Amino acid sequence: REVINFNTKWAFTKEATEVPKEMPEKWYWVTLPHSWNEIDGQDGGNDYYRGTCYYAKQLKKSELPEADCYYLELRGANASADVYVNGKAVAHHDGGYSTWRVDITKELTEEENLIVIAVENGVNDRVYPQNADFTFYGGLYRDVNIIAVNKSHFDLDYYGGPGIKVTPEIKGADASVEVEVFLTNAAADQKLVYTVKDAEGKEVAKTETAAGETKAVLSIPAVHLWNGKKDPYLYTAEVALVSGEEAVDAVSTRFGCRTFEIDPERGFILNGEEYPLRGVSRHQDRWGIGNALLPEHHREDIDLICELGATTIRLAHYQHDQYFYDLCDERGLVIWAEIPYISSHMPNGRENTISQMKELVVQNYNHPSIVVWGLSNEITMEDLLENHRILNDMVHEMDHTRLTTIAVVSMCDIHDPYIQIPDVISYNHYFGWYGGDVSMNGPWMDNFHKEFPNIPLGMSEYGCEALNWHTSDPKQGDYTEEYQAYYHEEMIKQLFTRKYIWATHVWNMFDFGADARNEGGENGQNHKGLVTFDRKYKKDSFYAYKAWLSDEPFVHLCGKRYVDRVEDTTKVTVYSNLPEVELFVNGKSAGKLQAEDHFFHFEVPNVGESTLVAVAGEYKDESHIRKVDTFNEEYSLK
Amino acid sequence: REVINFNTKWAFTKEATEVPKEMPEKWYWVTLPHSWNEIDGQDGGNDYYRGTCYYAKQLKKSELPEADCYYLELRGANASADVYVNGKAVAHHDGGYSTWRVDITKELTEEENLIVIAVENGVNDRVYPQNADFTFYGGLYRDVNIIAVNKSHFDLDYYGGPGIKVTPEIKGADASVEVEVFLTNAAADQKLVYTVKDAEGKEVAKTETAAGETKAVLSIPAVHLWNGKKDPYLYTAEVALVSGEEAVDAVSTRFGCRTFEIDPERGFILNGEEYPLRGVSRHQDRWGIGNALLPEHHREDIDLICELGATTIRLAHYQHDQYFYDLCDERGLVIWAEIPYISSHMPNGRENTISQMKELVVQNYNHPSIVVWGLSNEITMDEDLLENHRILNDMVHEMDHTRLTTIAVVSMCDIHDPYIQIPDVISYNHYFGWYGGDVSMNGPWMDNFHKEFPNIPLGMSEYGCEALNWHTSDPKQGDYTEEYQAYYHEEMIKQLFTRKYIWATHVWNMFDFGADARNEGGENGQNHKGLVTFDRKYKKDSFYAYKAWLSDEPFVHLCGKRYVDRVEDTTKVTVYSNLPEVELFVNGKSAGKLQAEDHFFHFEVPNVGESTLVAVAGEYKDESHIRKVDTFNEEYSLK
Amino acid sequence: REVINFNTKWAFTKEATEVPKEMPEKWYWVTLPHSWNEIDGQDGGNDYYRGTCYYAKQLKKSELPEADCYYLELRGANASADVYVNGKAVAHHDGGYSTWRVDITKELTEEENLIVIAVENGVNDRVYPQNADFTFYGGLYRDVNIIAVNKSHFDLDYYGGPGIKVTPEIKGADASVEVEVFLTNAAADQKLVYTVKDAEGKEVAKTETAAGETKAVLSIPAVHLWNGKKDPYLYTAEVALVSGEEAVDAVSTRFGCRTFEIDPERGFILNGEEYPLRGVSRHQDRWGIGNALLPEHHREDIDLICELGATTIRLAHYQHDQYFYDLCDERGLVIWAEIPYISSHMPNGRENTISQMKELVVQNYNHPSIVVWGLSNEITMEDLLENHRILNDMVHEMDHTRLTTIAVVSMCDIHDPYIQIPDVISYNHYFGWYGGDVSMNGPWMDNFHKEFPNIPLGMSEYGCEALNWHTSDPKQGDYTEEYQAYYHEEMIKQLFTRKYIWATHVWNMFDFGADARNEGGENGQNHKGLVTFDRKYKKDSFYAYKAWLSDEPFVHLCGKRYVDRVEDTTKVTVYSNLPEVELFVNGKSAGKLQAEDHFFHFEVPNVGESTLVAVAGEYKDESHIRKVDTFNEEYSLK
Ligand SMILES: Cc1cc2nc3c(=O)[nH]c(=O)nc-3n(C[C@H](O)[C@H](O)[C@H](O)COP(=O)(O)O)c2cc1C
Ligand SMILES: Cc1cc2nc3c(=O)[nH]c(=O)nc-3n(C[C@H](O)[C@H](O)[C@H](O)COP(=O)(O)O)c2cc1C
Ligand SMILES: Cc1cc2nc3c(=O)[nH]c(=O)nc-3n(C[C@H](O)[C@H](O)[C@H](O)COP(=O)(O)O)c2cc1C
Ligand SMILES: [Ca+2]
């Protein structure tokens, strides 16, 4: 079994109205990952190009390996896509966030075969998402592969799944692992070899059945538990299909062995031990390249998330890339995954919710980092309830090892009956950013918990917009770095001290692309990130969370970009996971503070040009301010 | 004077019928820098799209600052371009490598003005280059700006120049600096305020004239000499055009104060002291983006070149970006600049040679890193050709009394050819040891020319060898291995760096680069003679041969880290280092110490099982790994 | 509005080093019209100088009448040109055959302004023509003018057009004429006075509007139709731009009122009546002077074409002079005009086809002689099809009053897709000259008309080379005058008898410059003319056409240059449009013939020196022959 990368140099246009009969010669050349909205969907006006575009590329049999079957594998085509080979329709897909495949073998008539793929991201009442606060970046934004396999092979045609499914039960200090596989055109002549390898490639269990016995239970004694960031231990199930003595096809996945519970009062439980889920959400895009992410971009996103110290990520609002989920497995992050069933219930979208959800569970069942499947987000912003029951029952029938969840819009009456459908729920609240006061958040959650004490309640969104604006009068709607620091300061104090809230997710870890937005001085993005869209600047609110969640010791001065201050006595905030901070102004000491909540609020003289140095143990940070007569108007959006 | 960036979100297409009258809605969005050959001109076949493509963008007056005139400035449009404003042609330019500008004030008759730029890189007998070993990447591959200035302003119309020309003369410990300025629509009552600033922005000289006097001489006592890598000291010159009491327009440029000679026997001399020119060449492109380079890409290229330690760069084969030349001035690099008069003399290309060279000199006269202007490269690959060189050479001497002319001569050209006698200095492009012959021929070939022409300063403007991820224990010309390219450059270093009369040496090339007609070595569309790969991510072993000879950063580098599986029971392991002595350790036990005066430490090492290799010199270390196999890993072999 | 002649005494060089700062003193003096290819492009070897050349001339403000604007107008600069005023580039143009203009007022800052025009006719992949059987004569080969106008004036900046567009419609005995006008810098308080005048200069229509209303529909009572040679009646539209009581600028154009059809069975129709189009093509060059043609040369060419009696001219292969098209209007000739989209489709050439077609239509819209626009000639000798669909739509968009056509190479398959694009098509067939046999032509045409009964079909080229060689045994490839006359006798009998062939065009009316030609014993020329290159000799084939097409009575003795003949009894052809011819040999009747097809084939005793007299009524011609023992090898090319 060989996987041939098929990314290089496709022909591309928006300007075509029929599949071309022969390879286009005047189209634009792209190499995948590619989106045609990387610019016009990150800059405002809600005007990014939505419609049908064409990708063409020749497949040459001469350049292919010898095998009995050839699959086209698409890891992401947003949103709807039509595959052609030599002018003939061979596959159609709705769902921009999941893998799908088509055997093209019988169509490779020639030595030079024309693959046309049409991708459409327009408006319809049929394919989710249709209404949401993010760009539906069009195109082949994830890899396209060719898969050459033997006539008999592990299944490639069931909802883009790996062809292999792994389920551990923890029995004491051992574990039994069910490794089920799926085959296409097998012969009872053939055998199957199930192997589990440990972290060292060292074979720890093996067994051999017939090709008609497509399931096996292996034992793993003294099992190393997948225990989050403490020890994200991954095994590897591998299964070979052997014709006589020759392994003729194989497949594999990593997997972790753990148990978990989501307790209405104790919060999240991991392998029998409380393991609070405090974390962030992440969109799969980046400034300048739309959603056409490279492996390095995924690596960098999880690195920064790891530096902050999150224990959970909510991967909203759709299926993310398999590599990103793998990273979550290796690092021991606890993941919420969901489908883009969002904002506004479309009665004709029922089919597309079921097929994206099926794809989400089948393709992601083996990732030990995933614990909840999300049915919908803000969907109320009876047909709706049926759509939810159907999804809730299908997930519970596909996956006995995980629970279901929803994210609820802020205004939804808590007695809405759809809240009673999933196993757990979370609310998306913006008290103190979009209306209200930040102090309202704790009392709201408490009130829900009193009313529904046996429903585990999380916070799946909360956030506050921030760009390079500054003030000594931080308020809701000024968009300043300083007001956003305070908002997260207050949210951390309220939420991180409520054990019953089973998971919190900052909205959002990064600024992200949303072409309909036109606010804050920079249009086409949501600026509720802790980090900017290009991942180059970490806002002060990043270091408030780090102070609570990282054990790596640090000290961070807030306000570095706020230099020209008017007041004679200015406020200087310092974050540190160390217990005591001392701040110096021009070598003169403005006092010592011990903040057990890690937020050190100093009052400091503002005269002339001053350098500030905060000192906590062996660690230090440094910033500078300047006294001025008038507010530096560059600091102000208004 | 305000500079508005104008790069964001153009509509682009290759297959447009006519100049569009409304903002297109189905074209492809690009943000400049952009080249449409970023993929098809880096991958082989000599088939990159060459033709006319359109860029379209709206200019809204509501966004422009209030100003008397607005100029469209193009830093790079390859190769020929036409500019339309609300459908009317206002400008045409031939020359893909220089700045040109056009006043579009009169055509901004609407609140939204359609700005359309047609760009062409097709085949023709008139615009250089046409015949050369690199891709002619089409597009607006450098910045496009809008320049808003007062009705009286420093000249924006003379061959894309800055409007200011600085000429220092060194007199003992002091400097005399002539500053000349060029005006458009200036009034006899305006003044010119000339200032020279220190490296810290401190004013050190100041003078004034009436606008009718567009020259001034300012004194710099106790001048800080621009002295190469030792002290790349730069001043700034500022001239403001003043109406009554107010500056209505201002231009500035940095500059450095230095003298040099190119002595036929002692080589390059800088400020009276011998200053050997030992370096590389660099193309202005990069894997994946064609020649659509960002400032960080220019900074990375020069960082890598500085790390190697080159004292000179040959910026072949055309005018590079202003930011790269500034970087050279700041870092103390000595530069050869040239025009794309290349391979084959086109009789109808003469006007364009004149044009590009005028733009080359006018736009770059202020850069202290530049010491020679190159007229042509390998042009003989005949009387009309000779006259083209006389004219270029006399025009350059006419325009710039402070630099020398040079050429780059193709390997086979007879040394008695008449055109070698035309410029002030010459260099040859030789590949003995790569295109046939043997690496030992170079040194003596240079010695023989030197014997024949003892008064012609002679350099090596190209030499090099191809290398990809292929490996061998029997390196040979044409296996394309990393090891043979390493041997080749060791031997060139030994021959070239010990002959002081070779006034400048330039490895062809610092980086792998785009050449769509190349189809060899296992990866097509690239010349792989680089010391560093096309994406800048991998420094080949030959890079460290040069670092060991030219850098003062202490290091120790293990060669052959990618040649892991070896058949031989005892294997050669080369270390490069600028330290005096290296010790090699094999799975923790010493295989001995060596002291290589030419910095090339050749160890012989037992190859059994899997082995970890550690080389140690002082407090610096490097690590590699090999392992023993019974048959050659056919993945190391190009065949 | 004053037009100043600016042809006088330009400095010129072929060495294009740089634009000279001062007026030169050792270049060569030329008065335009001028081509530097006048000798080296008419003599063989395909070696005429192609490259960049400079023209330099001083413009002195004192010699200019006072006016607000000064435009340089160039009627023809072949092929690509740049204009400089005092070293400053002010215009660029690609297209050797059309008018282009540039406002240069702002650059007339000295009292002696140096005008430099760089003209280039080299090889590239972008500017047509590049591949064709004719010399691309470089230079300022048509007038250059200075046009001095008032600040407000009719448009001089739009594709070189006249500024006035005149569309006659007809219904019944009257005509209605729409006059549209286009203004630069007009002011609201200005007026437009429109007038239509008689052939005798008497006003027939008048009306006033405001400068903002730039269209007017004037009516001509009892209009005299433009009816071809029978009555080439021309009106004149004039429109004046008035400030107060003062005309500050005026433009005008002659025009003709006429309808026409191209019926696929009935052929060409003009004002309801069948009007058969039988004629010739004409290249814009002349022996000795290249294409640097004077008005007297245009007049003599058209006189010779009228004497022959053609009803149509195909003005191949490019836009001709305005003065030639005016003659065509004045004499009632029906014109085919075309752009040099020729021989071989260039992918980089699209833009230049568009620009030349725009200029062609904009500048020639008013010419009543012109009925068809030609898109291309032998262009096949998919990007091609798109290129033709763009041209076809653009012309149909710009000109609702004329049809589109093409000229198809001989071997092009009749089912080819591009033949379906234009309104009408024609072929270039040379059966009987470039292989084949002259009898094939008519039947070939019959096949097409059978295969495509409603695509009007014409013959855009057909011809046969002829120089001063002679024979009593005419065979294709002897280049004799006698074979060419036989060829044309047979082509007339086949073509002129098929009503459904909407237009026939002899290739060519005159021998013309083609520097790559090296045949027939005089290189540098295509010798397929009916008339020689210096317009001095009418070949016998000229008279075969005249006998069918002219109403002036005449008798023409063929073979006058074939004096020495070996045979005792020799063939003597007489052409005449009179019914009957008697031929006398030394005063003795050698026979009386009537010939319906006007081709009088006599046989005659050849004894001694003989004088021949051909007699029809009161009309005679005379010639001489001589009996010789052996063939005069001076009559023989080989
Ligand atoms: C995580 C997971 C992965 C699965 N993968 C496959 C597969 O790759 N091939 C297959 O044939 N069935 C696979 N199945 C089995 C189907 O879910 C099961 O057969 C289903 O009940 C019948 O599907 P159907 O209604 O489409 O016929 C998988 C099931 C789960 C839960
Ligand atoms: C480095 C340099 C820069 C110059 N810049 C300008 C300029 O910006 N504006 C101007 O009007 N003349 C400028 N000149 C003056 C021109 O050289 C002058 O017009 C000359 O006479 C024209 O010859 P050329 O075509 O060879 O440049 C400059 C000259 C030099 C050497
Ligand atoms: C025969 C003809 C002559 C024309 N002359 C002019 C003209 O002189 N000035 C002008 O502005 N437009 C002229 N137009 C065209 C219309 O005014 C045109 O729609 C508009 O001005 C520009 O359209 P474009 O994008 O095709 O250039 C002419 C059109 C035709 C068909
Ligand atoms: Ca947008």
Ligand SMILES: [Ca+2]
């Ligand atoms: Ca290519």
Ligand SMILES: [Ca+2]
């Ligand atoms: Ca000739």
